[PDB]
Nucleic acid binder design. Sequence first.
DNA 1: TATTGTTATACTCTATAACTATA
DNA 2: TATAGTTATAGAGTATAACAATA
Lengths: 142, 142
Amino acid sequence: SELKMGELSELLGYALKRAQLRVFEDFLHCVAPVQLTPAQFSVLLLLDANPGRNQTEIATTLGILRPNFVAMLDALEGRGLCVRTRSPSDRRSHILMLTDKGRATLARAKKLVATRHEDRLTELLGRDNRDALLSMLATIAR
Amino acid sequence: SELKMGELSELLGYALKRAQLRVFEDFLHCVAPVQLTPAQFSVLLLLDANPGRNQTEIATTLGILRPNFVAMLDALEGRGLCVRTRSPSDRRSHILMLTDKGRATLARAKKLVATRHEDRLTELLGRDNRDALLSMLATIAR
DNA sequence: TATTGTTATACTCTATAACTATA
DNA sequence: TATAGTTATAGAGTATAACAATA
């Protein structure tokens, strides 16, 4: 009455998706007090590390295509978490910077991520094992 | 002039998703001679391990919603790789088994993924490091 | 001419409600 | 009523072409 998972247990791609989907699902739950998807979260994180960059640069480093990034920024900018300002140098581009509200929302989101989510992962595995997992996934992506 | 990846380097969710997409992309390419998506591959693999089952049982085990599974089978049956047969006891259920064609297409894809894909990725990590990766990703999914 | 932001569009995936034919 | 398979639909996510403003 339970099905045999056959050779699927040994396909690494398969393990990654179902591993990715629960981690993302858990991310949405833990972080729901600030209402940020993982994509929105990373956009705030990248904006925080690299102030002064433009849409093309932020979107590419994240793997987001620029036609799909426009709608994401409208959400965050509509919620008053970041600003598009025209660069005086080259008025084709929008330089992107965080608001104070954005910096606060990034701050508390960072806590719910570390305390409720990322730390709950680190204890279910080795603190060293989780770093090895993170290293390998980083290697796989290159 | 290159972007600071900030705390994203330590977001496990992000590393999990971007690791998955290179693997899924690499999978698609290696298996392109047979025309099978990774999902279709697993549907054929699980049918091979679990003959005599119905749609609801196959679909639910894979995370496919049953309304989404219909067209997915339409494809594989249209390709003559598996067939729907009504069980005489309960004619609401469709019993699914792979055809001779289905198994031939499966044997082959299994060889294409094993040689070009799964073997190539085991080699970019330690053969022992990769089994620890598959162990941990399996752990995360429960 | 090339690039930035943008619109429009399309194709996949995923999600939900409701039908049909059985039971 | 309840369940299996199906249909239609709606929403994400992602992909490309093209156009206006600007370089």
